[PDB]
Amino acid sequence: RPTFYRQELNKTIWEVPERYQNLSPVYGSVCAAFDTKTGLRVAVKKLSRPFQSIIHAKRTYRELRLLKHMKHENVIGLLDVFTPARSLEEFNDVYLVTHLMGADLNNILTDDHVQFLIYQILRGLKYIHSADIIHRDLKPSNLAVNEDCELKILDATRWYRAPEIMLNWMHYNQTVDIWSVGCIMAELLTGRTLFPGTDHIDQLKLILRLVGTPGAELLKKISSESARNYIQSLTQMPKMNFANVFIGANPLAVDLLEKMLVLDSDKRITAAQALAHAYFAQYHDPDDEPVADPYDQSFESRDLLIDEWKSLTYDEVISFVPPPL
Ligand SMILES: Nc1ccc2c(NCc3ccc(F)cc3)nc(-c3ccccc3)nc2c1
Question: Which residue from 258, 260, 256 is spatially nearest to 278, judged by alpha carbons?
Fold first, then answer.
């Protein structure tokens, strides 16, 4: 049990172990800090109102469980989790400590940079997807890149969302993330957002303008009559030739985009399949693209009181084991 020191940052009081020094500000508030134990720069996130409602309390619990499970080089992992509280009764504040990453992918490329960056994302997604976890919100601001161009996955928003999440299909799979990667890859190659839509309707028109309106083989798999009516109403756009839209790009890169930006998610390439694509021949190492331990998601289907979620979160703070140096 370490000793804590109080401090006021951006009109909030931070109580953190003395082990973390020189706090500097950057869902919750985040501070950069120096960690005297590892000698490394860290990010300390103080959650805001972590147990205000059932939804917050479950969301706090979910976030701690996910971070505690991620042990992979291209996914953000948990260095430490702590509370100033000495008991469950006083437990009201949760802090999360992770590696401070240099910048996000948003604020920044040759084809070799794009290969390395997209390769690291797919490698992280393979790990995440193997544990039955879907990210659902992949976008450049959720991708941290240091000076070495080493990338970690963290955590408009609509520009990277899969068409089946736009239409609220209840049974989408992991490939909603592959769609996002496709949109990201296309932005890195061209400098431009692929689908910069102003709202949900406009967003889908821009998508269908590139990938074409869906054929009868995809229509026969849509369960919502209203969605089916809507889709068939809109004007028939032809599938464009990616080799023309992405003119001058590496043709292996165009080929991967065509396999990622597929409307039908049953036919969209997976992260593991994409890792073996020729586009990543330089980097692909099948002996060095691990999968994750199983992840118990059964709590997602539970309806519990705020104090029960809080209690379950307290247990996970106590049982936390720091990763090895
Ligand atoms: N097996 C599959 C494969 C893809 C599906 C899918 N793709 C999203 C989509 C978006 C736009 C469009 F024009 C055509 C399809 N949506 C839906 C769906 C279901 C209910 C409500 C809305 C979308 N079910 C699917 C089932």
Answer: 256
Atom 23 of ligand 1, residue of closest alpha carbon:
169
Both 129 and 265 in one domain: the answer is yes
The residues carrying an active-site annotation are 155
Q: Resolution reached, in Å?
A: 2.4
Residue 163 Cα: closest atom of ligand 1:
10
- CB of residue 167 inside a 6 A radius of ligand 1: yes
Q: Are residues 236 and 138 in the same domain?
A: yes
- In this structure, the answer to whether residues 61 and 123 fall within a common structural domain is no
Q: What is the DSSP letter of 149?
A: -
Cα-to-centroid distance, 216 and ligand 1 (Å):
12
Print the domain residue range for 242: 103-291
Q: Domain of 90: which CATH number?
A: 3.30.200.20
Among 90, 70, 88, smallest CA distance to 318 is for 88
Q: Per residue, what are the HEC states of 54-115? A: HHHHHHHHHHHHHHHHCCCCCECCCCEEECCCCCCCCCCCCEEEEECCCEEHHHCCCHHHHH
Determine the distance separating the centroid of ligand 1 and the alpha carbon of 135, expressed in angstroms. 19
Ligand 1 near 164 CB (within 6 A): yes
Q: Are residues 192 and 84 in the same domain?
A: no
Method used to obtain the model: X-ray
Residue 119 Cα to ligand 1 middle (Å): 27
